[model samples]
Target: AHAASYLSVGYFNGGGDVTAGPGGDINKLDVTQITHLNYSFGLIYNDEKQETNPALKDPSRLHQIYLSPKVMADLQLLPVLRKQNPELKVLLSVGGWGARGFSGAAATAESRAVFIRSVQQVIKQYHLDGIDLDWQYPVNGAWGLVESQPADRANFTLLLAELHKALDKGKLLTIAVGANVKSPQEWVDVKGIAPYLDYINLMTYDMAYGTQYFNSNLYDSKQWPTVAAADRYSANFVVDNYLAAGLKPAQLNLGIGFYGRVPKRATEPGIDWDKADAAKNPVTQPYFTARETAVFKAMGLDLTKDSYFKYNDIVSKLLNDPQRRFTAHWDSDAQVPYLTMKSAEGKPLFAISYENPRSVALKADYIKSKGLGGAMFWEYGADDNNRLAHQLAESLGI
Candidate 1:
């Protein structure tokens, strides 16, 4: 069949949710470099009419997959970009964080057919090379409007088996899954579904566990020895989990974020997150609230502070600041870096956990040594002059 290859994938957002306008223009995108470019997101939903639509409703649209007009507009670049980068395979990434329709579509054999055909229809019309089903979770009641059922565990595997049957001949099937399935109920049948996937993208970023921690670190820092547990929340741990679960090393792609997590606390470990009070601190910030953003703005740092900052913005603005308010520190054990912001009075304000070239290079080392699939970024838009992307390519020997 095909020759040996490694995946250096990037998710190019077709924004409509948190990032509203058309994002990461394909023309400006570095499509030539990466092996795969995931054009996100093609929505999967049931055609539930808005209101009072007995006549206006279209039942034929149920369980269908389609791109937004803005996304469709960006998709027009597919053929041109593919021509320009013959090696690049453009995968249509469907189902983002808040997306719906997965539970219903994968619920039954009949419903799965409708969803599969619609996905095929979208692929045919858009000229996409493959499909990346990013159902945030199957049984995890973490996101989406749909309910998470115990049945989803089995149904999800069935869905993947069917899709592989239909699309395996000349196409790829991949999934965007959680990094650490701390809860058994949140788990996917990775071993059972491995036969159906070309790759399983483990979102190893967002490793923050209630208490302030690295957004995405490659090793077990044990930086916060007491509260933090070992064999958890590291790139190595995640890849090993999937490997032990039956996925081959080559069939796993490590996920990294082009962003950083800004914790509200300045102390080490943020706040003893394992305790009851830490439970109130939140496992996930769910985007910096408008009010919180305003507070950070008033503090005079004025950097993007929705509890997260894009890597590009972090570099151009804060890191390049004429005054050294933010100081970068490396966690040698974790193989990543963090920043401590100081006030004009020279007091610690807060800390941010983010990835840098050094961290990215370390992860690449781990990837190559482990013989795993190459890295995939959460986005293409957050790079500073394509700094990190080029670093990763160089580090990975691309």
Candidate 2:
């Protein structure tokens, strides 16, 4: 039987020496172990008009291109596995964080048709089982782009309807949408598209990160911050938002990030983790991105302690005075935690924790308890021990 939960890996063709070449083998992925494998097929916008994001400006780095023939050839290896385990499903994902702008392109009839045509071509060429439209944010906005008119909202729904019309029985349609947002102001019109999609994945992580100074605590509290939604980043916010927007919970899949958000503080010397509470002001330095945190192991940072404990190492020593007590706040409504420490000069430094195994499990449970479809990870490679993915699979009956 296929697992109730689906684990997906992003097969990005851009970014490094990885390429589609003759003799490329798909069997390398060992797909029988996975129920659903989704590959980002690359830019669907008109190549001439598409502008690469500044964040994606490295040539050695990829800007999320589609799978080349060689890569597809390797992907064909799935058929072999399917022969034995026919329950497995493969999908083509389009538009990533880097290409969210194409969403605006799909706002028009011609452009939407162009995008749809490209999707159809991929389906025909690859014999794809389904398509995933990860437009990032549709009616809301994504990739720093502002919102389009109300007409775009209707266009968004109509586009999905058209794509559904063009799709075949064995082929599926899915979408990766931004987590729930308060009001329709920042969310897409899911009621419009849900009918056309086989399933919808709600990105439920990102409740907190180093960028924010104040947020909610995920545990031992009624609220926290970061992005899970209740505390603002709490999973509750996203899920509830979708339900409130009229999307069916059963069709929803929660997207969880495997990585932990690391908060760093710059403080005076001699301040132990526990003693920093009142010694001086603490400032959030930066978020240790997943790659950076992974390297923390090599740097000898202790992995035995959880983030709360590790952060206390710097917070306790900074609270010499009420004014000196720089601390993190957990927004229960938002479901995230944020830190704010005043500098000796009184300038505030801030940071917040992003998703970790503990947080992801909490969110996944929330999804299941709500009778939602299940959970998915942003990409399989980011977490330690693949902890996020493993935890999600375990939680959802995978």
Candidate 3:
């Protein structure tokens, strides 16, 4: 049966404060809606020599999951949830966007053994069911991340194999993967790694961040008419690449983002905002690069200049704003929803590319249709009314 997993990134407060204001209450989550809950993210300790790094060793780093007291308290509910739903699996997701120390830990056999021991200790200490490796990249780096050597691809496979061996019987081992955002090269030895992992979480979202493209579309949109079919960024594209790289459909999970990418400038006419002034705003700078950047430039679209907003924010800020009369537009070609609104002077004030219940339902349908292993989202806090989560659960018949 296809499963549903949820990732909680709000565990660590990165606002230079040790508070659980971001992750929200785990008690509020509808456990019946999901088969797994991934607590993100535990980090690699500064000392690779030690077999264990006690929780909350460093509060300054966002990757340290134990920094927030509330998060620790929230974790206490895991046992209770497990009791209520024995089929539910609770895993600690290690590593994130800029978190490092993976290369150092996985470099040598001794380090890899120690690392697995520490991970096992953490799992036992927290009474977790499994582990998830969210290594941003193995052989490449991004956003000032420490780059790994060419051997990282092979080292990663060995690391997973060791961890899988160290894990207790029935414990699951999974890894989060990119959707070729950097390149289609062998950053992950899919064939070698697949045997050890319970499944591969394809982070198909953020496929088109700065551009006007949907963050996690099920299919390609006709809006970008000239983008060759093979290069289109969508769930289908990600699944095809991973499957071709040697993963069974049953060993793949589609990743969804419970957020939106808001463009700085509207594509529609009648906007009164000055393009030059918008470009000067530091916040409006391009947040994406590579193929997406070139495509946006070729189209003369200012989509690279954009910001991110949670699904809850899109509802309370734009969809429910009184000053702005926003209209929801559906891209039938892509099966996603976006919003547009005008300023007081009738000039276009905002354009947001986001996912609503309708879009989520469509994605759930795709998961069922494709017979994928499961579906997973970034975080649980982003769902304002639990509408999107419930919709996904219903559509998937979970």
Candidate 4:
């Protein structure tokens, strides 16, 4: 059975390009739905110096909010929410995708000491509950970033061990990990790193980008290549792999993507039997939260070209759009839903595979069935009506 104390976490991107209006701002998140909130990014300070980057330390840009005055005002909301709900925990996540310096900083005792000091300072300065390490991959190259050596695998464990010693006993320490189960041992010393972390946030999405597939599907589709078939990019695969890797069920948090991937080429409404091809010169589509549409329009940008659609935009634009027509289809094997639409010329424009109340409910059920820790979403601002959040809460039995 799912415990009432199970963690329901959500990331809040302070620098998101969203509009300023009622229900459009990140400040208005339904904090009650989440037991924990992680502020998107706090960058590493130096390449080899191993100190907290001074550039990101600037008070003006620390929070990454839209306006100057709102930075403090918005951050103040977390403490207020904490006061209202004593159980709520807010963490400052350090290092984001492509952000560097982890290997250099964690390489030596001196650098690790400096890094730990900076972490302590930031937690104290922000009055945050804890810190989250979002290093993309420890011993591998990511997003064109420098590749780490095999030593990074052990160094990462040492970094966490040092962090555990430096942080107050009450302060929580967490890390975001990629969902790749096959080679995780090569990069992350799961058995070693497990003890130091309070919880592991498994990023199960972005498994396949540019290629036509669900961003965070629950099940593995047989359509994937045989080599990748055993470890298909799905929530189930992630959970099973981590459990097999010796992680306790309660120490894991399944990540949910609030946005969907849009492939430039269109696939049939039903499950396309064809294998996915490598996207050549894949086009980066525009991604907008519901509020972002107005922002994009004000900037005179074309909305049609946008590929990523937040849950709110999916509702307002595709689900509720009266001018345009969209057909919804479900993939039985993958256990996900996707939407397809055509252009004015009747040519297939694109397809979107996203999460909704139905899929969220199913995931919640899975969590309960497996006695897993709880659910976490990529962001809180993506859901405007809070429908998805509420749905997840209900499913979690919170």
Candidate 5:
């Protein structure tokens, strides 16, 4: 057992429904530092082949379903990560927000048993340690999936119970749950599932966008104290909601975003989100996925320029400037970064954002100070340079 570091890598195939090009290719990974991996698997059904959801109607949706990188890695990194971090646990996660349709497939005992068998096969075949179910509010009827009957709740418990029975004692079995107080699914009965799960990753961010508030900071400064109640989708609030739901703090892991959501901004100060002038507002702002943000730094863009442009030059540069240089903001408060820039005059402008080490370390402080299980991010590649991950590890005193 090595005393190195523990980290989780995740990849989501938003491009395809069945096949994830990234998930299928692990040889492309630089895994010298990774300790664990999590992957998106399975598909959401509309009771038929054609997806009713507009987001998933494309053939590319097929690529969204696949296994963790450990299952596809250079094959050498697999044993290397395991050998390097003996406590490392590679887990397969099922049912992301858009893929909730697969829940039906996981509902039945026989089906779940079969699913477990498939999991067993994949884990054994690839040497993974266990499974992570990211049902995205199971039984909630959210995300355009079928409503779970009252019994469906208990059935979910039954499913995990069976899965735990099949998994090796040392392997991990985790779940990701919503942090909202008014969550429709009530899928997470913490007490009910606690006995069966090793940990629960609570998605703690994404409540507000730039368009809603004139002032956009990574973490809401005004809402800092009551951030948990502000419910603007942040690390603090998610943990608060989970605790309110009876989940023990130690059993919960806080979820952080590698990317920032660019809400539409106004041409004039203090304008409403809806009434904000389109001609004056920028469109399609660049939000950095944790991975892509590094490209900005690699491209030699200035973060200070990007953050300052939010007010004055964003509109003019985005409109009239031809060689306008845009950069992403590293918001230390929220532990995320974003960029804003414009095209030719009368043309729409855009803002982009992402998460970085400055933000990750702040969130890690929340984790340690609160005595939570740990921190979880959307994907491994997003932290392109491993800066954010290392920051989290260091903050956790690991």
Candidate 6:
């Protein structure tokens, strides 16, 4: 029997084109596999009201929230496809990396009520399931002009409590939070707000935020003993931290970034699989992202990931076949596979670490063993042929 308890959620990008990046529109995303689909973004109605905003831009059309004009066709298809898979629940995900206004929107009782009402209005208008809050950070990590204050710590919980109460029965309230912070407690009050929502989507991927190591490693310090600090940047490390902070196992959902990360420049082949078996010492030197970014700037490589590869990019280009630059290597300790790059003359370049079917299987086993909720990936479009998605569904019995 398919395990209904195990939730398989995929965040689908509304405005992404198939050729743009690691993204797929609603038409291409296969809804039969996932139990829940989080629409990548639903921005707060901006003060400036620019048309570039994801929500409605025209003042006359100012309403609760409207899908971006670019993705209107994709949003229209969301409910229609559900006829094929009635079990699928669609959520309107609000807030993301560049998005702001969460602080001002949920600061006081008056503001909080309107914000919740606005979201609820759209929930009915779109005929969707619920809302997935994606506030970038509660207190400090917010980007640009996004307001961040210590007051948000308390206000954040109040917002969740009020929103949870506002939502009708069968409506789900969930928030996506960061997993790579040095002090996870400092970012979100995991213990305080644990009861205010359904599942806390722990972005367990991107663990190696500072260090250019495994983006989503299963275990830490297991790969290289010399790298003691590596222990802090593993999925297990983050999950253990959250559990210790007072989250029950089942209420937590582990995140998997479909795309991979690569240093702009690789001074050395980080881990040589060809010599991995022969040599005793696997690479212990941590390629710092800060230094890599600096080097990238100095060499004039696109710092904005204009050249980065989505999963499809990896499949179409990187994997040896004829492009002999990258060679694949599996990190047994981390339970993930990475590719070490070499020049034509065999000079070491950079290492690329990403999630694959084998790695997702290990994470599935980890999730099942931990008695934790199932996995959630960044976006559905990054998948090459739904191989990773099927592996997640099959492994988790979804």
Per-candidate TM vs. native? 0.84, 0.63, 0.77, 0.79, 0.67, 0.83
lDDT of 3: 0.65
> For residues 264-300, what per-residue lDDT tens digits would candidate 5 score against the true structure?
2322122233434756434323334433334344443
Give Cα-based local distance difference scores for all models.
Answer: 0.71, 0.52, 0.65, 0.68, 0.53, 0.70
Worst 10 residues of 6 by lDDT: 264-273
Tens-digit lDDT track of model 1 for 71-138: 88888878888788787899989887656667777888899999898878878888888999887678
Off by over 4 Å in 3: 1-21, 47-70, 181-184, 210-212, 224-232, 263-306, 343-350
Model 4: per-residue Cα lDDT at residue 292: 36
Cα distance off (Å), candidate 5, residue 337:
4.0
Query: Sorted on lDDT, highest at the top, how do the candidates line up?
Result: 1, 6, 4, 3, 5, 2
Ranking by TM-score: 1, 6, 4, 3, 5, 2
Query: Which candidate number would show the highest TM-score if scored against the true structure?
Result: 1
What TM-score would candidate 1 get against the native? 0.84
Question: What is the lDDT for 394 in model 6?
Answer: 91
Positional deviation of residue 118's Cα in model 5 after best superposition, in angstroms: 2.0
Task: Give the lDDT of residue 316 in candidate 2.
Answer: 28
Q: Encode model 4's per-residue lDDT on 159-191: one tens digit a residue.
A: 999989989989999999887764465778788
Give the distance in Å from residue 344's predicted Cα in candidate 6 to where it truly belongs: 6.5
lDDT of 6 by residue, 1-398 (tens): 65547988888766542213323556777788788999877766544432254443444433234456655566677668789899999898887765656776767787788788888887887778899988777787354435577788788889898988988889989989877553356767778888888887888876443334667788863553223243347788888988888889899888987777664223323443444364743444444345444543443334554334467667666673373656787889888888765544565545667888899999989999998888888878888878888889999888
Which 10 consecutive positions of candidate 4 have the poorest summed lDDT?
264-273
